[PDB]
Amino acid sequence: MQDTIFLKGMRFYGYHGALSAENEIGQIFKVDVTLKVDLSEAGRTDNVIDTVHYGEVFEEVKSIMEGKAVNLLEHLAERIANRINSQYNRVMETKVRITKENPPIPGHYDGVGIEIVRENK
Amino acid sequence: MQDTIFLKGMRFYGYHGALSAENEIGQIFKVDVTLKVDLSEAGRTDNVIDTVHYGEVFEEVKSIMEGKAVNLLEHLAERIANRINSQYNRVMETKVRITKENPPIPGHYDGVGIEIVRENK
Amino acid sequence: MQDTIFLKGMRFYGYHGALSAENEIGQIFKVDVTLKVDLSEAGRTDNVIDTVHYGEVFEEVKSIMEGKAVNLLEHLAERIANRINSQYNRVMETKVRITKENPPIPGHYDGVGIEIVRENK
Amino acid sequence: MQDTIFLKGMRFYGYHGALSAENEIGQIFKVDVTLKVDLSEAGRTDNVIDTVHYGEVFEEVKSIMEGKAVNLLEHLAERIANRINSQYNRVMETKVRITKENPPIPGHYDGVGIEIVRENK
Amino acid sequence: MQDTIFLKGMRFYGYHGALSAENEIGQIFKVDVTLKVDLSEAGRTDNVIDTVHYGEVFEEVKSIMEGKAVNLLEHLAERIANRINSQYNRVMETKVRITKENPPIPGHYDGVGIEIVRENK
Amino acid sequence: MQDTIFLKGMRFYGYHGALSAENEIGQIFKVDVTLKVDLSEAGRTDNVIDTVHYGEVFEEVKSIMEGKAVNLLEHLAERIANRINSQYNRVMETKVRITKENPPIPGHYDGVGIEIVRENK
Amino acid sequence: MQDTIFLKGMRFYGYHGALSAENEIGQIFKVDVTLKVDLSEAGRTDNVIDTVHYGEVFEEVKSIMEGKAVNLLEHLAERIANRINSQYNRVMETKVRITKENPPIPGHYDGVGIEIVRENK
Amino acid sequence: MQDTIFLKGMRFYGYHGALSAENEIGQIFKVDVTLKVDLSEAGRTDNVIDTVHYGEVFEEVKSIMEGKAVNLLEHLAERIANRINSQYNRVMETKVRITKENPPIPGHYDGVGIEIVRENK
Ligand SMILES: Nc1nc2c(c(=O)[nH]1)N=C(CO)CN2
Ligand SMILES: Nc1nc2c(c(=O)[nH]1)N=C(CO)CN2
Ligand SMILES: Nc1nc2c(c(=O)[nH]1)N=C(CO)CN2
Ligand SMILES: Nc1nc2c(c(=O)[nH]1)N=C(CO)CN2
Ligand SMILES: Nc1nc2c(c(=O)[nH]1)N=C(CO)CN2
Ligand SMILES: Nc1nc2c(c(=O)[nH]1)N=C(CO)CN2
Ligand SMILES: Nc1nc2c(c(=O)[nH]1)N=C(CO)CN2
Ligand SMILES: Nc1nc2c(c(=O)[nH]1)N=C(CO)CN2
């Protein structure tokens, strides 16, 4: 079952980070959420009720990325995956990738971050 | 057997979507189709008849992405995969990814979408 | 063993294609070659003789992509993989991806193509 | 366990290479480091002490990419993976990808390079 | 008066070109149209009737880029500028840039093309 | 006097547009604001009080792009330029460019929009 | 007279440079050539004989960028502009921009280079 | 005299900024330096001594962008232009553009910055 619903490159300005200066000025956070969902039912019916509505998922990601500040990307991603898994039983597994394209690191790079994969129980 | 024929970043303007406003103005839809096909025969013969002609596949994708409007990306992708699997027995599995780079979602992101994988029976 | 030597986005102007008009004007062909090679020996010795020299591989890819014209990307990729596998015993598997970013297809897309994976016997 | 901490597109100017001319003028080296780390502990605690701090990892990559010159990308990557595995027991596997976007190769391409994956024992 | 209405990167698949092979397979044509129009009236009134509607302009560009085939980009651009100048008296000057990103030229480049500027009399 | 302070590629999700469907779903608006300001005073003193603070300008652009909906880009740009000219006497001329990368237009293009230049009296 | 014929982002691998190491390994050179040519004649006639054929210009640029090695970009650009001005009387002014995206400079940047503008006498 | 020597997209990590938090963590600064220099002498002689060596200019830009911290981009740019004008009499005018792609601004944008043009007396 390799069917998925995805939201790529979501960007939210937030104040997450371990260092107080970054909690102070903030930065853009890029998020990729991929969901394992069997889309064969919606595929035949064309009824939105038989799949996971991506607009709602975005709202969920937004609510966490733009809510209270946390020290780690790991924790934000854990909160996001848990949020999605809890409210959508059709989702079998949630993968969340959060990239800091401009973190507090003296150097030249495209980005740093984390990715976690969590099955829905 | 990890041989494939691919069509990346196809873009079609369409009126698909669950919300009537988007069925009204439309938007660009980006499609990636990857096909599992054993290319060792064509690889030795150099005869187009022994592989799946990518131009034809494109025509198939186009016909669906630019035809009648549907509510979900899941359904468009299901129609595409089924179309390709039905007409090309050499295709062992069809993966279709459809991305909405600018869907009806208030925010900043690179894209949202779905991907399904369907073996040809 | 997930060690690799890679050459990404190689571009050669060539006259390959099934339709005579394209054999006539040509186009750019983008090639990605990934090689499964155990790099632990070179990793400790730092001697180029214990790994596969990427410059040589490029020469091999170039010689095929810029040589005689063929009808299919499948056949070019098969010739490339076979070339690399034959001359480099350290290579355990050769993956070749060839993309036509601007093929003879009326539409909007980022690219179409094929990818094959061939183990060295 | 598909949880990861990543650092994408790090870029360092260095003098690594087999040919003396390139050891002489140098070039930019792009590095991607992906780490297999269980982030469920940090995910619940929000304490940086329970995950691998990405800033430190960067420092490690930097120290190698910008230190003494070596002939092969394989060797730089082997040194990086070994460095990370040695100092971070929470890391279960280190993947390092080093790309030379502008190596000593007469042609047109996006990049050439290597990728290795090393589990921490 | 440095006010403008612009349409950047329009892309149309067409069969324009001096060589019969290219009139045969076609290619994508990228068009940039910039219009010198005093926008102070619309700027205060917020009524679409006091400015040049960009949607209509696009229709005009489309009609030419996707209509009958011509040998030169110069001629397509001349037809476009004349079309816009004739139907929109508010337009004081029309600049049209047409780029062939993949013309019949053996080599490596981002694009070739022409740009003309025509005042409306 | 060719000194400038600039803010490139600002992006705001808004509901501006002449067609009610677009006022309904919205889209991203990209804004470039360039300001003619003599920076020789700040250049020698290094005191923020002698130049125009770019953070404040952004706040001004944001307030308009994210406030009440209007039919035309011309009007949004006129409001922005007037806002900046009114509150910053050091600004000699304000140029505002607003691009709709995904407007209600059936086709393939990079963007459409307007640019106005307004001197401060 | 703001009409132009352009060739953007041409790329040639060459061995130009003041330092012997770079004359030894080479690098990619990106060239932009813009030509001031009145296109109103070709614009009405649609005959290639009344404009400057861009394919030929490319051949000229290629012949210099890929011929004998020189120390400076200034000199390559001077040779190119002079070549174009000499053979095409319809060309009123030739602008040549040559960029070294990866020159012998320890640092992070997108490119360095020169641009010259030469009227045809 | 529209001849120029340019250095585009130089990137340096620095601690410049008016707010103490940003002086603390830093960020990447992108710099474009364009120089008005008559290149006809070097164009005929091919001797580096008759033009301005771009490598040296880079060293100058680097020394300022990576040296002592200042509050404003205006001041950094003023120091750079003055540095270049003082040491290179062949330079008739220096244009410096400094972009902060990720400044302390809550929002979505590509960049903010300043550009100054200074003739050499
Ligand atoms: N997974 C998913 N969610 C959606 C979809 C869709 O096609 N798939 N379409 C929508 C209409 O805007 C809204 N939400
Ligand atoms: N899979 C596949 N399809 C094709 C190919 C090709 O090389 N592979 N070449 C074509 C010639 O334009 C047309 N169609
Ligand atoms: N796989 C591989 N091939 C190479 C390498 C290298 O580091 N790895 N370095 C080279 C020096 O330019 C030349 N060729
Ligand atoms: N893996 C990891 N390392 C970090 C993180 C983080 O969120 N994850 N946050 C930091 C604060 O800048 C510093 N270092
Ligand atoms: N010049 C111009 N043309 C338009 C504009 C606009 O803002 N400016 N808005 C439209 C609404 O989609 C349609 N057409
Ligand atoms: N024009 C301008 N505005 C600013 C500047 C600056 O350097 N120039 N620096 C700031 C510090 O974040 C804030 N605002
Ligand atoms: N300036 C110019 N040169 C050309 C043109 C063209 O349209 N303009 N078209 C060609 C056909 O490939 C060949 N050469
Ligand atoms: N303006 C300028 N400066 C240079 C040039 C060049 O061609 N032009 N070439 C160099 C050789 O690396 C070094 N420095």
Short mmCIF file of N, CA and C in Angstrom, two decimals, chain G residues 74-119:
data_model
loop_
_atom_site.label_atom_id
_atom_site.label_comp_id
_atom_site.label_asym_id
_atom_site.label_seq_id
_atom_site.Cartn_x
_atom_site.Cartn_y
_atom_site.Cartn_z
N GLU G 74 37.62 39.80 -19.74
CA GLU G 74 37.55 41.08 -20.50
C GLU G 74 37.92 40.89 -21.97
N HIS G 75 39.03 40.20 -22.16
CA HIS G 75 39.57 39.88 -23.48
C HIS G 75 38.65 38.92 -24.28
N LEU G 76 38.07 37.92 -23.62
CA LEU G 76 37.16 36.99 -24.31
C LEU G 76 35.94 37.76 -24.78
N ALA G 77 35.41 38.61 -23.90
CA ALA G 77 34.22 39.41 -24.19
C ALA G 77 34.48 40.43 -25.30
N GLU G 78 35.68 41.01 -25.31
CA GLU G 78 36.11 41.98 -26.33
C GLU G 78 36.19 41.30 -27.72
N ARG G 79 36.72 40.08 -27.72
CA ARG G 79 36.82 39.27 -28.94
C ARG G 79 35.43 38.88 -29.47
N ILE G 80 34.53 38.52 -28.55
CA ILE G 80 33.18 38.15 -28.93
C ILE G 80 32.42 39.34 -29.53
N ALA G 81 32.43 40.48 -28.84
CA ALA G 81 31.72 41.68 -29.30
C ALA G 81 32.25 42.16 -30.65
N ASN G 82 33.56 42.08 -30.81
CA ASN G 82 34.18 42.50 -32.04
C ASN G 82 33.84 41.55 -33.15
N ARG G 83 33.68 40.28 -32.81
CA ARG G 83 33.36 39.28 -33.82
C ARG G 83 31.96 39.52 -34.37
N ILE G 84 31.04 39.77 -33.46
CA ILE G 84 29.65 39.98 -33.81
C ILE G 84 29.46 41.30 -34.55
N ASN G 85 30.08 42.36 -34.06
CA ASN G 85 29.98 43.66 -34.72
C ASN G 85 30.53 43.67 -36.16
N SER G 86 31.64 42.96 -36.39
CA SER G 86 32.30 42.86 -37.70
C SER G 86 31.48 42.17 -38.78
N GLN G 87 30.81 41.08 -38.40
CA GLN G 87 30.05 40.28 -39.34
C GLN G 87 28.58 40.59 -39.47
N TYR G 88 28.06 41.44 -38.60
CA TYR G 88 26.66 41.78 -38.68
C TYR G 88 26.44 43.29 -38.60
N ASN G 89 26.29 43.89 -39.77
CA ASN G 89 26.09 45.32 -39.84
C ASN G 89 24.75 45.75 -39.23
N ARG G 90 23.75 44.88 -39.24
CA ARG G 90 22.44 45.18 -38.63
C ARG G 90 22.55 45.34 -37.12
N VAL G 91 23.63 44.83 -36.54
CA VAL G 91 23.80 44.95 -35.11
C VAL G 91 24.36 46.33 -34.82
N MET G 92 23.64 47.12 -34.04
CA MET G 92 24.07 48.49 -33.68
C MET G 92 24.96 48.56 -32.44
N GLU G 93 24.79 47.59 -31.53
CA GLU G 93 25.53 47.51 -30.27
C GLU G 93 25.48 46.09 -29.71
N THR G 94 26.64 45.59 -29.28
CA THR G 94 26.76 44.26 -28.70
C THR G 94 27.14 44.31 -27.21
N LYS G 95 26.32 43.71 -26.35
CA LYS G 95 26.62 43.62 -24.91
C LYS G 95 26.98 42.16 -24.61
N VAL G 96 28.11 41.92 -23.95
CA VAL G 96 28.53 40.55 -23.63
C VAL G 96 28.81 40.51 -22.15
N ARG G 97 28.25 39.51 -21.48
CA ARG G 97 28.43 39.31 -20.04
C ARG G 97 29.01 37.91 -19.86
N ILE G 98 30.12 37.79 -19.16
CA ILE G 98 30.67 36.46 -18.99
C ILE G 98 30.80 36.28 -17.50
N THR G 99 30.22 35.20 -16.99
CA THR G 99 30.24 34.89 -15.57
C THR G 99 31.01 33.58 -15.31
N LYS G 100 31.83 33.62 -14.26
CA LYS G 100 32.59 32.47 -13.78
C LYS G 100 31.82 32.11 -12.48
N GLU G 101 30.99 31.08 -12.52
CA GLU G 101 30.25 30.73 -11.32
C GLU G 101 31.10 30.05 -10.29
N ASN G 102 32.23 29.49 -10.71
CA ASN G 102 33.11 28.80 -9.80
C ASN G 102 34.56 29.14 -10.05
N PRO G 103 34.93 30.41 -9.88
CA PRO G 103 36.32 30.83 -10.08
C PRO G 103 37.19 30.41 -8.87
N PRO G 104 38.53 30.57 -8.99
CA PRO G 104 39.51 30.26 -7.94
C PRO G 104 39.39 31.19 -6.72
N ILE G 105 38.21 31.38 -6.14
CA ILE G 105 38.05 32.28 -4.99
C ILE G 105 37.47 31.57 -3.77
N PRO G 106 38.25 31.48 -2.67
CA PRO G 106 37.81 30.82 -1.42
C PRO G 106 36.63 31.54 -0.76
N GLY G 107 35.42 31.07 -1.04
CA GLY G 107 34.26 31.70 -0.46
C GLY G 107 32.93 31.22 -1.00
N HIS G 108 31.87 31.90 -0.58
CA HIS G 108 30.51 31.56 -0.98
C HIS G 108 29.88 32.71 -1.75
N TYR G 109 29.51 32.43 -2.99
CA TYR G 109 28.94 33.43 -3.88
C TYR G 109 28.30 32.72 -5.05
N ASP G 110 27.44 33.45 -5.76
CA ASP G 110 26.75 32.93 -6.93
C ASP G 110 27.58 33.09 -8.22
N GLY G 111 28.46 34.10 -8.27
CA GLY G 111 29.29 34.33 -9.46
C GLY G 111 30.06 35.65 -9.49
N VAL G 112 31.05 35.73 -10.36
CA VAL G 112 31.85 36.94 -10.52
C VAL G 112 32.02 37.08 -12.02
N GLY G 113 32.27 38.29 -12.51
CA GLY G 113 32.45 38.42 -13.93
C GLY G 113 32.53 39.82 -14.45
N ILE G 114 32.32 39.95 -15.76
CA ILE G 114 32.38 41.25 -16.40
C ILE G 114 31.29 41.35 -17.46
N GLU G 115 30.98 42.59 -17.83
CA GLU G 115 30.02 42.90 -18.88
C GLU G 115 30.56 44.14 -19.62
N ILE G 116 30.56 44.10 -20.95
CA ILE G 116 31.02 45.24 -21.75
C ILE G 116 29.94 45.56 -22.79
N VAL G 117 29.87 46.79 -23.26
CA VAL G 117 28.86 47.13 -24.27
C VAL G 117 29.68 47.81 -25.38
N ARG G 118 29.53 47.37 -26.62
CA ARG G 118 30.31 47.92 -27.73
C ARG G 118 29.44 48.24 -28.94
N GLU G 119 29.38 49.51 -29.34
CA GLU G 119 28.58 49.84 -30.52
C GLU G 119 29.36 49.44 -31.78
#
